[PDB]
Design a protein around this ligand. Structure first.
Ligand SMILES: Nc1ncnc2c1ncn2[C@@H]1O[C@H](COP(=O)(O)O)[C@@H](O)[C@H]1O
Ligand SMILES: *[C@@H]1O[C@H](CO)[C@@H](O)[C@H](O)[C@H]1NC(C)=O
Length: 245
C-alpha cells in the first residue's frame, strides 16, 4: 500500500509520496528509461490501496488499477464507493470486501462524465493540497454532486501527478494555495495514452513518433512532439500505459 498525510504536508513530503506511488506500480521493462506498466494483472494484485488522511486525521482508502493508474473506487469508514463502469464493478469483487454496504456512484470515472456531474470542466476547478484535504473531507460521507468535483481533485493530485513530473511540480506549487490547472496540466492529462503509444512505437522507429502529438507547454504555447529527445519524454512522463491497453 501507499499512504499520504495532509497534516504536516509540504512540497517535499508530497513529492516523496508521488515517487512512492510510482514505485508501487509493477513493471517488467522500461522504454527510453520510463517504466512500462503491465498489460494485465489477474485478481486482487491488480489494485493498489492508497490511504489518504485529511488535515484532521480522517481517512479514505482509494483503489487504483496498477496497469493504468485508474481510480476505481474508495472506502470511507463502513461504506465503499465505486464508479458506474465495468472495471470498477470488477474491482468491487476484490477490494473493500468488509464494507457494510457498497454504493455505485451515478457516473463513470472518466473526465467527460465527472465534469457533467460536477457541473464544471477541470479548467474551472482549483487543485492543490488544500483542495485534496477538501476532497477527502467531502468523500467521507456521501454527496454524489460534491463527490464528482472531489474526485476530479483526487485524480489530478494523485494519478495525474504520478504520470507526469510537471503535474507533480504544479501540485507542489499549490501545497498551500489552490489554483486551477495550467493549460499544460490539461494537455498532458489528455495526452497520456497518446504519448504512451508513440513512445512504445518509437522503439522500432529510431526514437521517432509514428504520429507527432500536439501538446501545450509550460509557457501555454502549442508544440509538436516528434521524437524521444523531447523534454516531455526525457524528464516529464514517468509511466507508460501499455499499448495492449
Ligand atoms: N478515475 C480516473 N483515474 C485516473 N485517471 C483518470 C481517471 N479519470 C480520468 N482520468 C484521466 O483523464 C483522461 C480521460 O480521458 P479524457 O477526458 O478524454 O481526457 C485520461 O487520460 C485519465 O488519465
Ligand atoms: C526531435 O525533437 C527535438 C526536441 O524536441 C527537436 O529539437 C528536433 O527538431 C526533433 N527532430 C526531428 C527530426 O523532428
Amino acid at each position: 500500500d501507499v499512504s499520504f498525510r495532509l497534516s504536516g504536508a509540504d512540497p517535499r513530503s508530497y513529492g516523496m509520496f508521488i515517487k512512492d506511488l510510482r514505485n508501487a506500480l509493477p513493471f517488467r521493462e522500461k522504454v527510453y528509461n520510463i517504466p512500462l506498466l503491465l498489460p494485465s494483472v489477474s485478481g486482487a494484485g491488480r489494485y493498489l490501496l492508497m490511504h489518504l488522511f485529511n488535515y484532521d486525521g480522517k481517512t479514505i482508502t482509494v483503489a487504483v488499477d496498477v496497469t493504468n493508474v485508474y481510480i476505481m473506487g474508495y472506502l470511507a469508514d463502513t461504506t465503499s464507493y465505486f464508479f458506474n463502469e465495468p472495471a470498477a464493478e470488477l474491482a468491487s469483487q476484490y477490494v473493500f470486501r468488509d464494507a457494510r454496504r457498497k454504493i455505485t456512484l451515478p457516473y463513470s470515472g472518466n473526465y467527460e462524465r465527472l465534469q457533467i456531474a460536477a457541473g464544471k470542466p477541470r479548467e474551472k476547478i482549483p487543485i492543490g493540497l488544500p483542495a485534496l484535504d477538501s476532497a477527502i473531507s467531502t468523500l467521507l460521507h456521501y454527496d454524489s454532486t460534491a463527490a464528482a468535483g472531489a474526485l476530479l481533485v483526487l485524480i489530478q493530485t494523485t494519478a495525474e501527478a504520478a504520470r507526469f513530473k510537471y503535474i507533480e511540480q504544479q501540485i507542489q506549487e499549490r501545497a498551500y494555495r489552490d489554483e486551477v490547472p495550467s493549460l499544460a496540466t490539461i494537455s498532458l492529462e489528455n495526452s497520456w495514452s497518446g504519448l504512451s503509444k508513440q513512445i512504445q512505437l518509437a522503439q522500432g522507429n529510431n526514437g521517432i513518433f509514428r504520429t507527432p502529438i500536439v501538446l501545450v507547454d509550460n509557457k501555454g504555447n502549442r508544440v509538436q512532439i516528434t521524437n524521444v529527445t523531447s523534454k516531455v519524454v526525457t524528464s516529464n512522463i514517468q509511466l507508460l500505459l501499455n499499448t495492449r491497453n
